[PDB]
Write a protein that binds this ligand. Sequence first.
Ligand SMILES: CCCCCCCCCCCCCCCCCC(=O)OC[C@H](COP(=O)(O)OCCN)OC(=O)CCCCCCCCCCCCCCCCC
Ligand SMILES: CCCCCCCCCCCCCCCCCCCC
Ligand SMILES: CCCCCCCCCCCCCCCCCCCC
Ligand code: SF4
Lengths: 478, 102, 162, 100, 168, 300
Amino acid sequence: MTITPQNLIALLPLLIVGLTVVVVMLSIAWRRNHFLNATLSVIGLNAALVSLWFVGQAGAMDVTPLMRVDGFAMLYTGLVLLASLATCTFAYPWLEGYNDNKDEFYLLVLIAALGGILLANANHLASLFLGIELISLPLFGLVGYAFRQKRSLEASIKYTILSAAASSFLLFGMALVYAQSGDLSFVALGKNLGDGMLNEPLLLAGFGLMIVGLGFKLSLVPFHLWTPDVYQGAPAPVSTFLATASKIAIFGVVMRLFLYAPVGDSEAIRVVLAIIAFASIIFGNLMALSQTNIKRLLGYSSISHLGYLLVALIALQTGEMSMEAVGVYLAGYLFSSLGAFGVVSLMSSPYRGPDADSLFSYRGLFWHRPILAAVMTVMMLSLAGIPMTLGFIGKFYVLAVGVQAHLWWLVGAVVVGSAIGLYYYLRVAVSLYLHAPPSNWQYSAGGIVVLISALLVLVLGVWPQPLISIVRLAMPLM
Amino acid sequence: STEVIAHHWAFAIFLIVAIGLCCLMLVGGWFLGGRALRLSAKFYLVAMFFVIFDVEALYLFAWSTSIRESGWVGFVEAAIFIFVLLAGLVYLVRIGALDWTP
Amino acid sequence: MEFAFYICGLIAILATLRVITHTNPVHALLYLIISLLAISGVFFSLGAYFAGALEIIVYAGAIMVLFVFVVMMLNLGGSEIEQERQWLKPQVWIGPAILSAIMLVVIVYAILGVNDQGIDGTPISAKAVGITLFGPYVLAVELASMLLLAGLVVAFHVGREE
Amino acid sequence: MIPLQHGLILAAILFVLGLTGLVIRRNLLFMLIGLEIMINASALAFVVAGSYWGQTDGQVMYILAISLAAAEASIGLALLLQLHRRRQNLNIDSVSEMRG
Amino acid sequence: MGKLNDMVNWGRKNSIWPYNFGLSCCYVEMVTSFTAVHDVAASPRQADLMVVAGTCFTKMAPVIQRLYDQMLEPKWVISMGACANSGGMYDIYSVVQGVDKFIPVDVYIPGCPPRPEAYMQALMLLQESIGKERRPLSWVYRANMQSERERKRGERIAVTNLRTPDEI
Amino acid sequence: ISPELIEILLTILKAVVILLVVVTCGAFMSFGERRLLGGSLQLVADMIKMFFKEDWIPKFSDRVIFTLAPMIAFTSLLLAFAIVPVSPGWVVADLNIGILFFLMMAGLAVYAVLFAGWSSNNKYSLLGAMRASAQTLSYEVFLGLSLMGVVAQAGSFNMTDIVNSQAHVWNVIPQFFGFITFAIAGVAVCHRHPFDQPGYHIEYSGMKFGLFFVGEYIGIVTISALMVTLFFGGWQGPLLPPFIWFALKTAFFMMMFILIRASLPRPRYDQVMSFGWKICLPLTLINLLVTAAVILWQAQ
Ligand SMILES: CCCCCCCCCCCCCCCCCC(=O)OC[C@H](COP(=O)(O)OCCN)OC(=O)CCCCCCCCCCCCCCCCC
Ligand SMILES: CCCCCCCCCCCCCCCCCCCC
Ligand SMILES: CCCCCCCCCCCCCCCCCCCC
Ligand code: SF4
């Protein structure tokens, strides 16, 4: 398909982020200025975020055999851009203490945001694969950005090796699917079959290997073991980005894949995803019980919350409000993880050398950082699914969707995992309120970001109608 | 046909005769006659730059054989590709990654 | 044409098996280059002329050069590699080989139950790849340039010396 | 003339061999080698599938796959050099400081 | 068989690459030999002739021995000048008295220094020695050649009058 | 006995004739550059000495790598020559990939330098080989990009299509910057002597040294013939038979390489890296862009 100028209007956030990459790289080539390059990165991300409105004026259509732009694409592009802006905002105070180069961080964050936007607009196996790699490789750089630190180098090596293996699995599965189907478009995966011949073995095996790669990327059991190690070893703004934007973009493109594919409603694939979601919920809640480190605890939290999202995804073919539920849960989980990892990033900034620790020490935080402690306890209550928080609205959506489609094992899994989550999140909150023995406007901007996230979580927990209205407004092409 | 299979036979004969020629050259050489610091990281950097720019060159190889069929649209797309490539090259030059002299 | 496919596939399988079991890294990389040439011959036997050309140009001519360069820079004169031979102990390799054989059996069982009309081997030239590359698939081209830039920046930041 | 299942079986064999090499080797270099074998086998599978259907998308997916292979090899070898610089060994069992 | 050995020795004699490892004044004469006014027309591993041209000191002798050992068969040695032949005028504590104390020598050149035409004459002598002996064709009996002294005796003793030193 | 079998045998004989001629011209022009700075009897004598020299593989070195580096340095550029058309009806392989096969052979040919460096087992030799390999990577990064203007004007990768597209005007006139960048790249990746040393030929003795010597001069023959067939019409000429034109142009470029060796000094290594990464690569990209613009502008 050719590209008309209206298709370029639908291409707007991708173009603006790519031009931002080029401009930031040319500015680094001119002179290494940390403030100017961070400003250019956030200006480009804000420009893409506000160009989403001009994309919305254009309408839902297809720009390529590869990209399809609609309200679904706009919603997940907005979520990715919000996570990227928050990552840059948290990264500046952390990078102020980094004695080596600092602007390659912003370059890689921009490229990873570009991959997230491509995954948001994806309609093709080529675009899915390219978006996953475009997310993964800047994350290879960012997870080990402080490679002189031992844990950061360890996490970089682990994430690079395991993500290359997952990409190989995904690529081989896509190759088997293309061997069976003959077209790489999402709508044509299983279209040639019919009348009960949907469970073709090569198509199912290709989707299984794709599921292996994607479930690595989504921290789903049994491809989950990297998550606490990589989350702990990575720098804290990198942990923020890797928890929010990567998971959101990959789950959005997985939702598109299972919505458009005629094989997405296969009984075997549904049962396999049910087993993966059940094990993900239970294991990610059980492994976070005895966690004394906040980063590993949030990693197992990510496993459990992606399991809840997967439960919402299983009922996509049966129900109709599954896309709305996934959007509401993804907004809630985005703001919760942004607040939690932002508190961790602010208390670990500036980077105090590669030879020193990077620990958070959450005990007795309220007696010297009361606002951050309030934000962190609101985030822990939100991740527990407790009412008056947006995480409860997401959990309610997931349970309503599961009850509607008679997924009773998943409903019981959500209940049990929610109780276990209540235990460890409440332990973290009371540890914040127990007893224990900055000075620049970018740290203030990070604090403002986590505070606005906390206010959004509280307000949309006690009044979730605006979020539901703007999520139902984002309907994809049926 | 016969011309294409004749050229295939000629090319196969060329490859095997050249390889056998070098192999028997070494065989005759080995058979005849009597008998009685710290490696700098710049080499890895330039090799990796070669790998990356060779992949971009492969994309331009694909474009160059079908310039007329893609038209001015393909020219604009390839100009964007080449501009990103040149911006990366200017970046590598300016950060001293391609400067070998101190 | 099918003889070229079967011979090159056999050579690729044997060379890969020699790669994963060898102890000297240089000989392992040489066997890997041999396997890449065999896979390029497989590509040429299937009509994918551009794919085989890039298999020798890029995979066997750029990536393996980078691996060879790294092996040189490591100065491996028996630096805790050749002395161990730990992977040849059956308690180390028997389990993973069993697991990978089970995976191969499952994948082959999936493959054998597909409709097969055969590969005609009609040569798909690089002109068609360039037409479809800068036509329908051109956002893939631009974002693949961005992906290569990402790899460039990441590897430069990690692999400096200072 | 060449069955599609034969090319797919060849690609599956090479992918399985690459995965075995990735698992059984403690050396980081041979793990990167096994990763290259796996991604090249997946790219070969894409070429086989594209040549069966007569479409040009298989070689396009090959090109994207080898772009990923080149960039991942670059990043992995930079990480290997950093590990050899700051620990003077490439045994991956020693890189286990984060656990639990 | 007979013509084959002749062609092998012909190939060895018509292609000789010297490793001119000289140490003193004799080496500078051999540097002057390469110019276009004399028309005389590497590494020890591929060189087949070693031209030892200069004084073999007690400290330079291990270097000469190692550089000769690095060469490969067939190998030939030409000593140039009195120093390489016998130690020359330096019968002193710090000079090895002749390079043939530790490496075999195939052709000797008297002089101090020899002129480059003497080196070309020694190249001709070495070519004749190579062409007259024979080596095994595949995996050494050198020919006992007539000495140049007795061969040239008649035309040397037949000399009667020479130009006087007074004129030029 | 069939006419098809007669044609097959004639084509095989043509391929073997081309191979023997290119190898013999490599050896003969090796002696020619030796004498310019009878004689075939001297070349045969040198070949006999190389045959009967004691072939010695070092004790503390690998056997396979040390043996394989000269094999690469010979066969890579020989098979690179395997695509060059010398006359209508006189070609070894009329491949659809062509100049892609040349790029394949060059990318395999860097392994000769790398493997000689590994099998040298000397720190100075290994460092010099790392420098030489970095140089040939820096100058083969743009070899295909310099040829891409010619490929764009021809619209194909076939060499016969290229020399047929050079019918009205030789490609040296439009693709002049492509010509100079291909000349510099071919000079540097074949280790000609503005760029011969930044040595890795040490510890090679007898037949392996002869293989390196003959292989690099065969690479000079191959690059000269490719220069002719890519920028100077190939076989095309007004009056003379086509092979005579091809042979005289190829011999002119071999003598041009001799003059280049005898007429240029040695740039420093840093200058060589800076040139190959700052001037030639952007020049090749800009030349390809301008060539595409002119091609699309003229074909209204
Ligand atoms: C040290 C040596 C180790 C061993 C090396 C390999 C030895 C054996 C190689 C030769 C095997 C026998 C001949 C194989 C068939 C030759 C003909 C052929 O490939 O034809 C197929 C195809 C023709 O297509 P075409 O004419 O363009 O289109 C018309 C319609 N198809 O044409 C093509 O597809 C052409 C492209 C394939 C050409 C392959 C050439 C050889 C590749 C390996 C080079 C090895 C170099 C030395 C080692 C490097 C470092 C390890
Ligand atoms: C229910 C959702 C979250 C609401 C806000 C949670 C609390 C935010 C911080 C408010 C101030 C807390 C003060 C705690 C003082 C503890 C004193 C203990 C004395 C023994
Ligand atoms: C340096 C030149 C290398 C050339 C390699 C190929 C040689 C092929 C020789 C073919 C000769 C006959 C060509 C057809 C007849 C036209 C020419 C007649 C007068 C020579
Ligand atoms: S023989 Fe005479 S000229 Fe030669 S090195 Fe000895 S002192 Fe010098």
